[PDB]
Amino acid sequence: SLTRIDHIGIACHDLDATVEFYRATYGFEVFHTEVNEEQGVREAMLKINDTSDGGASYLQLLEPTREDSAVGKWLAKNGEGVHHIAFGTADVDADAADIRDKGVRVLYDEPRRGTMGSRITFLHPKDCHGVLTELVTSAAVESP
């Protein structure tokens, strides 16, 4: 089951400048930063709250590592702004299979590595009323 909003993926041209914007404006601090070379992003997670399923909700700020990437292409076409939304689950493999069986395009056969060792997959935005939709299971198992 999808039991939380895990994060909002926000694309930006300059991660350091956008991180400072969120710190100066709202007081949000950096929980974690990492580079994902497969996905072509440098990212910062800003924790906003904990959630009733034992997880948490973040802003995921993303700058591209290369123009030929999902985020690099998107920023070139659309400018900075919301890129994707992510739902958390205790079993992304099972939820992804159930959604595949409804005829929504699941982009990966098997979940791939995401932030902080998470396992992630994506649903095609044209099958989700225009919203790129991520499904994620955290590496550290959650206690509701």
Add this chain to the structure above:
Amino acid sequence: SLTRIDHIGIACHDLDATVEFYRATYGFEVFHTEVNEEQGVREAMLKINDTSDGGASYLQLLEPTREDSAVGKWLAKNGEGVHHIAFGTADVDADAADIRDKGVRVLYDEPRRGTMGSRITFLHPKDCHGVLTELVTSAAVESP
């Protein structure tokens, strides 16, 4: 202080069809529906989780009531997708004043009525790295 992600505002051409998409695909049910004639929207709130500040996190699905509206104009230019993000606070008036004093454009002098009697304001997307940003205080006071 901004203590939670309150909701993701998602624009759609057909609220009933998009509500059914989220129910059939993810099992998300309708928490509340209302029309806001000032804002020019018909909306459905889908509750995803509770949050550690005593509040909750929703998907806010929005169809326009008229073409000459924030959401009607946006859908005409961009198609269906994420329209805004909202942060919850126990005191939107104080947080909005503190943000005004940083030179970010606050669109309302005083918070206006939003969903379920909430009080809301918005920050201009061009001052927020492309993200239309809502600040909201729930009408029913929260117990962390």
